[PDB]
Point group: D2
Chain length 319, copies 4
């Protein structure tokens, strides 16, 4: 008996003698007949968008579908574009309550290009979803023969088939000849150990990201404050620092109850609480190792529970 | 005889500026150091005014010294290094240096960094390489150098093309030099400018608001740099507002939030259809430097894209 | 009350108004008076050698001393040269039975040089040895503000103060302002979960390393076989491959009961069992992620339990 | 008209050699490919005889083609690339390529690697850079290129000085070129040699046996490369036996088992007192290439160390 694995597709096909149908995920399965060696695969095309256009409603749709269909399968593989996979994967790492593996996969080369990375990445996502040892590690990304945790994983290069890395705390396991040697699991709470429950949510709190650089304008921060955003994530310089005019808009905003999270445009290392910035004085939250797009994911979900900066900081210390 | 080395400080000391030879006595063995305090700001508050001051200062003082060492906070040091890399016309060593640890803290990195930066500014071999950043025993070009970690002393890396040379026992083995045109091979001349074109940066992510991009278009900004997803792609509502900016007087440069790799021309977005420029390896803060200086010379996106291809 | 931390020194001082004494470790403590903020520190100079001359008898001395003095302290810091720290740290990761933290520290710059990395590295090793959360993670290396596991940790650069990295599975935690956020623990068995017991050993089985390259001579492998070595670790090309003449000497040797372990001169990734080499046919063992110097450490200890290639392979899969 | 490109295979096919244009039809759009099978060996069995054959072949055939692509197994590709980098005197592109995945395996990397290698061999811009290795969309110099992972398609990296250019949509943006002397700027001429000096490699570690080093001294080897601990240091009993070799007719090069960084002269070991040469950034297998070729010209350790300083 092989395990039953569902593939939920969000866009185009990452692999491509069969008749091509109307349905992307049906073509993908025919493209990779070796999947029959390892799994009973059923595909469902949940949505069809470019990853660059990923959004809150696809996240709510995905988490509810995994949580509803948990008992009907032994594991899930999600096909997803590479551009925002690290954001979906963390959203699902916080909101999926299903105890069986959830594995995200993508591809850096077109399925029709020479040396397409899609086929074998899918094969490896299936292996990983089928492995009993994959369970209870949170939501995973499988890319380039490597199992990565949904919180740490990020894209490091604009084109490399090896771009996906857990830049801070390393990967969970490597995949050789259909076998995984797992040597790590994320300590941070995930999945059924988080308080986040998206089951009845129709929308997510509005959270925007502003960038910090030399001579930064305050107009982007001002624009999000004027629209009454619930929160704002600062892509800070070095250890979460802010240009003067940006600092002063987000300081005012935190005083009117905007949640403000200091992250960093620097690609590795933590933005650490009251180091460079008196977070205590301003009502701000330090993101830790979460990059700006990841700190947005957690801040949205934090604002479903609480508006309190001190409560939001303890969430940023435990998830 | 030892080289004459001018230390320009931009903020706090990294070991004030007239005391650095006492603070690092070993400087006395490799150069005649003079110190000037050009400005005093935290690097997180770095601005066009400081850049304009630093370039005019070096360009004017080229004849008075054999080499410059600029002390600078780490947060925006990669921005200032590229601005000077394009605007400096002195072909003596200009070496930027800072410290990841406070001067008064245990195992402070500033003293040896300063020492190594003076070594680099005193080396003949350093001439004609462009503006350099010396951190953690390494010589890096101003175009490719960026900080990779929020706290690590080893943060500064040329993440796409690698370093120019490693420094060992006060000696540099240089094995590389930037091909991109720099200093006196660029047409950017800032001698008479008192302001720089307005260029802002917007972030791409899931469900990104168009409100930042729009805020910059309503302000009449001269340029907008997109920190795109993957290879310079744009969230739908962000793309819509930048497609309108680029037809309306706003040069639009696609860069990436991805910390390594080029945003390539016509690959992910039809740049020709939209009037957009691809940044290549320039991350967004670096793309902002080159876009400001391009817009002192041209608002034509075909000519801005030629500049993005040569510097 | 501050914790009681013992520093065991093996060589010179990594930090240096006090009178300098005869005893290296007494000078080190006076060099770093801030240690009094975090610990009651007692130093013992166990041996005084250069790390390049590290050897089996210092390993047996260190493991027995930690195991004997476990109840007398709350944690151990070992000062050690950088050149072979990654070998000592794994030997001690397999043989220490003490349940309190054991932390190795070193320095890439002379204590007398500008910007000496020693002082603050020692401070951080002490922090890490004093942290209750450090317990049950195996033997650790603390370098450049980073807690690394004794199995994965290796030196990556001949001079960089940041050289120490867990190249395959990432670090265990980062150290900011005297506080560690631990996000990983090694899955591989260590310390009190290994069967290795050095308590009554006077010596270790003889295990040598040979290098593989183009046109490699067999004379180094032959030389270890003639001296009757218990085992030989191959520093293989790519995935553990061997030059012809080296292959043929180690094949013969495994047939006369030499244990042969295929590692790789490649600095990251596993040498994987029957991939490139028919380990089954030759009686050879694949090292996994263990580099040649680390595979030597485990192979020595494997040969205290067993000479059987299949038993040695299961040890290489679990430690 | 398209460039004439000669593919020299050294073993199995990476997509036989006359069929590669059918196996990767898209080659037809960028070059006129001819294929020759020079040798057939696994790269783990690479030897001096193969090296001598490859150098003589390229040097002789320089006038018959516009560019060479050498297909080679990954295990020792960094050794062959540096040997040719020092011995080739053709100043047309010589590009080495291989594959981390079998030709018949899923998502095989060989076809695109081959395609990219031909792009690199066809590019004018590639000339005068030395012998190159193209893997995973990247152009790397033969001196610094090494494999960093036992299985990763992205394994090949210039780990000290970085790549020369990235390949995008069949186009190379070159931003770097090796300063170390290569090809027709080296004095190494292998046209008349039928063997190479005997150089062996020994490993340093805790409690290292002197028996390997001694085995090579008793065989009368011309050279021994130490893979040292840290910055080229030697285990006591290894040091003793190499101190005796260097006074007895055995050139001794200190390198490191550490996968990045230079072994620096006179830093950790008194090289002058002992007759030793420091390898710099050359890892031990690379140091072995340069030591063999140094010993075709000189057994003087002061002159061998000058060679280790220029190539």
């Amino acid at each position: 008996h092989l395990p039953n694995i569902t593939i939920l597709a969000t866009g185009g096909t990452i692999a491509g003698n069969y008749t091509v149908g109307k349905v992307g995920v049906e073509n993908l399965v025919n493209a990779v007949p070796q999947l029959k060696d390892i799994a009973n695969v059923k595909g469902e095309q949940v949505v069809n968008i470019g990853s660059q256009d990923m959004n809150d409603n696809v996240w709510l749709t995905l988490a509810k579908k995994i949580n509803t269909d948990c008992d009907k399968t032994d594991g899930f593989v999600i096909t997803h574009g590479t551009t925002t996979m690290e954001e979906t994967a963390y959203f699902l790492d916080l909101t999926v309550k299903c105890d069986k593996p959830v594995v995200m996969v993508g591809a850096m080369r077109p399925s029709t290009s020479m040396s397409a990375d899609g086929p074998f990445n899918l094969y490896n996502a299936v292996v990983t979803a089928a492995d009993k040892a994959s369970a209870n590690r949170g939501v995973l990304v499988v890319m380039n023969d490597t199992v990565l945790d949904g919180r740490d994983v990020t894209t490091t290069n604009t084109t490399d088939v090896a771009t996906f890395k857990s830049v801070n705390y390393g990967p969970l396991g490597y995949i050789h000849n259909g076998k995984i040697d797992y040597q790590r699991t994320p300590a941070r709470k995930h999945t059924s150990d988080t308080p986040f429950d998206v089951s009845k949510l129709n929308e997510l709190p509005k959270v925007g990201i502003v960038y910090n650089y030399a001579n930064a304008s305050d107009l982007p921060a001002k624009a999000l404050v004027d629209a009454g955003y619930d929160g704002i994530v600062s892509a800070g310089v070095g250890n979460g620092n802010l240009y003067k005019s940006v600092f002063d808009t987000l300081a005012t905003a935190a005083k009117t109850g905007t949640a403000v999270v200091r992250s960093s445009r620097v690609p590795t290392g933590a933005t650490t609480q009251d180091a460079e910035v008196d977070d205590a004085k301003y009502g701000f939250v330090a993101s830790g190792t979460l990059n700006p797009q990841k700190a947005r994911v957690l801040l949205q979900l934090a604002l479903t529970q609480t508006k309190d900066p001190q409560q939001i900081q303890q969430i940023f210390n435990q998830y």
